[PDB]
Ligand binder design. Sequence first.
Ligand SMILES: [Ca+2]
Ligand SMILES: [Ca+2]
Ligand SMILES: [Ca+2]
Ligand SMILES: [Cl-]
Ligand SMILES: [Cl-]
Ligand SMILES: [Fe+2]
Length: 687
Amino acid sequence: HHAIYNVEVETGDREHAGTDATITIRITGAKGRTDYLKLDKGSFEAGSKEQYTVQGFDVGDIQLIELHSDGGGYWSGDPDWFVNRVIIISSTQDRVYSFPCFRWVIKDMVLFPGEATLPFNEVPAIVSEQRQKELEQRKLTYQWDYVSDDMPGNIKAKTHDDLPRDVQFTDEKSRSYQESRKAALVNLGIGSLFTMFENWDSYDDYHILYRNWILGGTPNMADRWHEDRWFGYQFLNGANPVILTRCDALPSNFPVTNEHVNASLDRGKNLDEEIKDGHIYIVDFKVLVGAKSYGGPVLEDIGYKVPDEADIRYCAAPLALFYVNKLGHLMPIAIQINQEPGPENPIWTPHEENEHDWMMAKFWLGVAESNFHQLNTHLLRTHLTTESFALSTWRNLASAHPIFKLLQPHIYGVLAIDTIGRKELWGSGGIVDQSLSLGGGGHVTFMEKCFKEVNLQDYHLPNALKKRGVDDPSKLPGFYYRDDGLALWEAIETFIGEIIAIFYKNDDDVKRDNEIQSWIYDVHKNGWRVNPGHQDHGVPASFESREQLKEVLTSLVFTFSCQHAAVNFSQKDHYGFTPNAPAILRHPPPKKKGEATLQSILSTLPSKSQAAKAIATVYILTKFSEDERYLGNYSATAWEDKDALDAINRFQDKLEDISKKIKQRNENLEVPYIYLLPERIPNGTAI
Ligand SMILES: [Ca+2]
Ligand SMILES: [Ca+2]
Ligand SMILES: [Ca+2]
Ligand SMILES: [Cl-]
Ligand SMILES: [Cl-]
Ligand SMILES: [Fe+2]
């Protein structure tokens, strides 16, 4: 004759989560559906758990609910309502129904009870219809847009506030970001006054520049940047640990011989023998040829052609050779500043007659490294490329889908920061233009050039390390990015495998899942588009197995969290003392040996205000928000399935073990490697 429904609603704790809109709820089940019933006694504050008792038609077994908000009245400041979950008990049913949400309620929100499902799993027809309608609507809200033909697809949004609220920064992240921008302007202005009439005449002058910033500690390379051992160390454990490969033969255009490097070898063998023993490594920045730097110079194979106080910046495409010495230290042993060898682009070594020439060579290798790292390793290959997958998750996976639930905490952030970044950070005029040689426009062309070579197999850490020849700790010791990254790769892969096995019982279940198929196909066709001049991007058009699904999800999750953390949060230590890693140089490279002086070097190195702006950029890009959730913290995820909860438990406990092992390893290091501690790795790419 009627049922009594006990309704409990948990509102999210985040700022503005609450609402004063009038809320109603309609309940549907096997027997029919109630009317919209008022939940209108008391307030919905952030963090609240509020209870209601409403009476209506007995729907029998409950199958879905619909919340409605009237959107507030004249005085409502922020009617949008963030709902974590609704729990209902019906007087006629011996069951507790739990409806996870974790999304913003704007006007209407449909929710289903119980565990995640694949689209073909058996559910009431009205559930399947609502699921199909959700996804129709996703496609109108979440649309592809592109910087150019040669960039990965991004979310269509003019500014951050045009984004769907589910993918905007939380108010806490927007405050953390806007406050960081204000603090940077204040610290720049105070440091500008303090240093205004400073005679800039030594490398140690640059130490002033980080002193009035809250960076979490003096840059850990400030005291040792000038030592070859610590210069070499950072190609393993600094901000850009992705380019060094094992050298099994010198490139024909980098004609280093035993006579150039023998004074550096110290295990009793010559250069050819050390190459065969796997102790010789190399970096090749050839991708930077053709790069257009601010003020006009265009990099050639030979460097630059024989050209008041204009802002003119330079870069380089060097090769550099390194050697693992008998103590296990990676030492820099040769640098050629540009690609085409000869007298005007010679090989520089730590044994230069003129010590300033070797220091200048190391600075040219750093400028190439900085521009490559910021634009390719960090901006393109974390943010801009994984942004396509975040967009495709919203377009193609229903909120009921288990892989939607898995990805939510990891995709969060990237749409918001990238929408902001296109306007304020690496877009035209942004803080990047003030701080990189390739700023001014050349930085977009350069990312385009890099994106043409991008392949999804690059995001597979064990395969990429093996491919680079850097995975054998007996030949290449002291490589903590590799050690910690591989431990976390395995932990994430194990977890994802266990989630997949709960919902997909065999390969057929993958092939039949039209949403996961649409998801990968959307990236394949519209996300990482193989356009004229592009290599294949390694994105499959479909999934055929559980293992293939695991491998793509692991790559993606590991990149959003760990890889971004390793190449982003390492920036204070890498760049905070400018001479450790200059990102702008002001004169072209030398065309003969014996020229460099401390003074010609200081005039090539960034100006005080260029260096200050680099520090400011790093400060902004590396600020953790006070609401950040770190790796494995799934406190705001929508899981209900008991087995999924247990898989999460095992994963968190694994992460906890990896954390203690990293801290134990660190206690014996001269310079602890902390960027891959789980407690410092955000779930996502949000800054
Ligand atoms: Ca609100
Ligand atoms: Ca109440
Ligand atoms: Ca738990
Ligand atoms: Cl009713
Ligand atoms: Cl679930
Ligand atoms: Fe970032």
